Amino acid sequence: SKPRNQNQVMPYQNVPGWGYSLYKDMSVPLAYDPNNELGDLRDVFPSAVDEMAIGYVCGNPAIKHVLTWSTTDVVQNPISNGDDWGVIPVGMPCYSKTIRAVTSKTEVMDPAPCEYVANLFSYWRATMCYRITVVKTAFHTGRLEIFFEPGSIPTVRTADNLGPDQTQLNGTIAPSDNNYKYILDLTNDTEVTIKVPYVSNKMFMKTVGIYGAHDEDNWNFDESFTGFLCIRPITKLMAPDTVSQKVSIVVWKWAEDVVVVEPKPLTSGPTQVYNPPAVA
C-alpha cells in the first residue's frame, strides 16, 4: 500500500562540513568496509602514551641553555650570559630568539617541547618543573642563590630582540632575602628540581611569548610570563688551578599539572619552521 505521509515537514540547512574545526562527525571512505577499525597499538609503540596525556610530553625534560660560572663572577649579580637570558624568565612560551639576517633579519627559536607545544595555543597555565644541575669536580665549590620574583622584568630593548638588565639585579636592589628562593651548596648537592606552580592575577597566561616582539612589541612579552627567576653567585667559586677556574650549569625544563586554552596562537604570521637552507 501507498499511504500518505502524515509525517512532519523536516526543516534543515544546506550547511556542509558543519563543525570541521571541532573534534567530534563524518567523511567519505575509499575502502571496502565502513567498520574499518584497526586496533590498539600492540608492539607498535612500547610506551604508556606519547601523544595524548601531554603531561607526558609537556612533562618531557629539555635543556634550554648552559651558563658558565667563573670565580670572578660577582656575588649577587646575575651570572652573565651576554645580552641574552642566567636572567631566566619563567613560563613556557619562547623568549630567546635569534636572527638569520642576510638584511633579511628573519628570527628563529630553540623551543623545547614544553614550549614548542604552547606556541600552538593562545593561553596557558601550568607548573614548571625546572631542574638545574652543575658540571664540576669535587674541588669546585661555592654557594648559589636562586630567587623567584613574579611580574615584569628589568629589560633592555632592541629593534630586533630584547634582553635582560643586570643592573637592576644587584644584591642592593633585589636582595632576595625574603623572596621565595633556594640556596644550592655545591658541596652537598648538584641537582635541584624546582617545581614552580602557576601563580598570577590572571586565571591563565598568554602564550605569545616573544614574536614580532622587540623594543616596540615588548609589552606582549611582558604579558607572556608570570614572573622571572634569577641565578646569582652568593659565594664565589672556589677552584684551585689543579682544576678549571670555572664551572658550568644546565637548566632542564619540563612541566606538570599543565593545561592549555585555545589552539589559535597569538602571532601575526602562522607557524612555520626554519628549514635550514643550504647556506647562510
Partner: protein, 196 residues
C-alpha cells in the same frame, strides 16, 4: 614571621559645608547631564583600593607582598549642627575612569546615579553609616608593587543643597568623619619589589 595582620580602621578625609555654599560640593546632582563639560558636579572621590593602602599607614608592615584579594569596609560618621537640612548619597563605580564615558557614574542622571549600589546619608539623622564594597575586580587579585589598578572609584554626592537659616553662623556647619578598612583579606606572595 608573624601569624596575623592588620585590620585596623583608619581615617581618610573630613569635609565641611555651610548653607549658601555654591561650589562643586553643592549644585546637588543636576537632574540631567547633556554635555561632557557639565558633568554631575560631585563632591569627593577616592580611587580604591590604592589610597587606602597608601595613606592608611598599613603599607610598611603590609608591603613586600604582591597579590591580594580583599573586601573593603568603610563608614562615615557626623556630628553636625541640626539647623542644616539635606541629604547625601555615596556610591562606587568600578573602572569608571577607563570604561566608555557613557557608562560612567558621572555623565549620567541622578536617577541612574542612585541606581548604583550604596546607602544614603541624612545630614541630621544618619549619624553613623556603614558600607562594604566587595572585590569588584575582574582581576583575580590586586597587585601592590604597582598599586596602579584601583579597580574602583568611590564617589560621594549631594542630594539636596545644604539647607538652613537665611545667613548661617560659623557652627552652622556640617563635618564628616571617614574611616576605611578591610575584611575578607588574603595575602600570599613575598617579593623584593616595592611600591614607591
Amino acid at each position: 614571621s608573624i601569624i596575623q595582620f592588620l585590620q585596623r580602621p583608619v581615617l581618610i578625609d573630613n569635609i565641611e559645608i555651610v548653607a549658601g555654599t555654591t561650589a562643586d560640593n553643592n549644585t546637588a546632582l543636576s537632574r540631567y547631564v547633556l554635555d561632557r563639560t557639565n558633568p554631575q558636579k560631585y563632591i569627593k572621590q577616592w580611587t580604591l583600593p590604592s589610597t587606602v593602602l597608601k595613606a592608611g599607614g598599613k603599607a610598611q608592615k603590609l608591603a613586600n607582598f604582591k597579590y591580594l584579594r580583599c573586601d573593603v569596609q568603610v563608614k562615615i560618621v557626623l556630628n553636625a549642627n541640626p539647623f542644616i537640612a539635606g541629604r547625601l548619597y555615596l556610591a562606587y563605580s568600578p573602572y569608571d575612569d577607563k570604561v566608555a564615558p557613557e557608562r560612567r557614574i558621572i555623565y549620567t542622571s541622578r536617577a541612574g546615579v542612585t541606581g548604583y549600589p550604596g546607602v544614603e546619608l541624612d545630614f541630621q539623622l544618619d549619624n553613623s553609616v556603614e558600607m562594604t564594597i566587595p572585590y569588584a575586580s575582574f582581576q583575580e587579585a590586586y597587585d601592590l608593587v604597582s598599586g596602579n589598578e584601583d579597580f574602583v572609584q568611590l564617589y560621594l554626592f549631594t542630594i539636596a543643597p545644604v539647607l538652613g537659616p537665611s545667613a548661617e553662623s560659623a557652627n552652622s556647619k556640617v563635618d564628616l568623619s571617614v574611616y576605611m578598612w578591610l575584611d575578607n583579606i588574603s595575602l600570599v606572595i613575598p617579593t623584593y619589589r616595592l611600591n614607591p
